């Protein structure tokens, strides 16, 4: 069974950038719901129920037909949120190999941010903006709803191993920012955990 | 070009059910944005700009390829919101031929209500729940994002002429209801405009 991970910090640890009220709801209601609903669909499926979540979402086509969508959405959401929480932290600095790569693939940190802000702002409806690693090259993609690049192109419209990501469902920003997603996206640069991003980039997969 | 319609009522006309703060933002920001982006896309398309928005969204396949998505989303948004505002009104009563048609087609009003709530609640991510007329038979369907049943099943996954509809984008309910979409949904029953739904049904077109 999956369990909701404890946050690696207090709900107010990303203030004054991300609001504690939302962090609390986002985690204890939305993410909890994805865990609960994924577990419910997995009750009958011991062979799958026993897989890691990042593993499960890479094999949605091996699921019975009547379970593919429920687990795409809920195991998707669990995998994305698990990554999200760990990919946020104040006080980090983009640096080292990661930064070199970003400059190699985007020209400058500012160009990269710009492409990230674009993809994050242009995702219409619910979804996520990602910095992925594909074939040694850093790219910016986005996905719909709780889809992940780990699901593959056929399913999610994108691929690649996620280095870091931004949730752009309105539940992630509506209380503080309402319609002003671009403000939220700019705020993200303050709380994005470059240390975890660097480590994920170091592991390389 | 399209104009942002004024609402039929003050921003607090749907209290204590739908919050005035959301009505104002929903209208002056989100709807205003769909209108702007639809108009911007339409600048170079006089032949399409000439059509009522409701007819335009039936002709998305006839647009230039590079125009299809932007207008799908934004003209969709404009058409759906124009319907929405007109389709909200307190103290109406489901009666006459429409009430009869619902009883005929769903078995009862209660069966209909349950099917509608199910659709509204199960729409994962952003979208709408609809009562549509398909031929001479009413049905409940939902669409993603700003898609409309008017766009047809190839595009939206649904078809039929909308009689009434519920916006289940988080921006429509997050300030007051947060994650509690079912609370928002039950509240819809207090503000749905059965007379306009009836008026749309009578017309059938």
Curated annotation (Swiss-Prot), chains A, B:
Mn(2+) binds at residues 26, 81, 167, 171. It is an enzyme of class 1 (oxidoreductase). One of its GO terms (biological process) is removal of superoxide radicals. Keywords: Manganese, Metal-binding, Oxidoreductase. It catalyses: 2 superoxide + 2 H(+) = H2O2 + O2. GO terms for cellular component: cytoplasm; cytosol. The keyword Coiled coil does not apply. The keyword Cell inner membrane does not apply. GO terms for molecular function: antioxidant activity; DNA binding; manganese ion binding; metal ion binding; protein homodimerization activity; superoxide dismutase activity. Its EC number is 1.15.1.1. Belongs to the iron/manganese superoxide dismutase family. This is Superoxide dismutase [Mn]. It comes from Escherichia coli (strain K12).
């Amino acid at each position: 069974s999956y369990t909701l991970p404890s946050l690696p910090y207090a709900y107010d640890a990303l203030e004054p950038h991300f609001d504690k009220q939302t962090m609390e709801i986002h985690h204890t209601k939305h993410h909890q719901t994805y865990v609960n609903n994924a577990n419910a669909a997995l009750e009958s499926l011991p062979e799958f129920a026993n897989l890691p979540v990042e593993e499960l979402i890479t094999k949605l086509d091996q699921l019975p037909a009547d379970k593919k969508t429920v687990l795409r959405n809920n195991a998707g959401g669990h995998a994305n949120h698990s990554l999200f929480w760990k990919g946020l932290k104040k006080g980090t600095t983009l640096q080292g190999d990661l930064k070199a790569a970003i400059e190699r693939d985007f020209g400058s940190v500012d160009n990269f941010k710009a492409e990230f802000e674009k993809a994050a702002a242009s995702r219409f409806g619910s979804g996520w903006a990602w910095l992925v690693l594909k074939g040694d090259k850093l790219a910016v993609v986005s996905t719909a709803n709780q889809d992940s690049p780990l699901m593959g192109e056929a399913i999610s419209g994108a691929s690649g191993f996620p280095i870091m990501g931004l949730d752009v469902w309105e539940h992630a920003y509506y209380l503080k920012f309402q319609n002003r997603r671009p403000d939220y996206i700019k705020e993200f640069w303050n709380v994005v955990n470059w240390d975890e991003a660097a480590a994920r980039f170091a592991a390389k997969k």
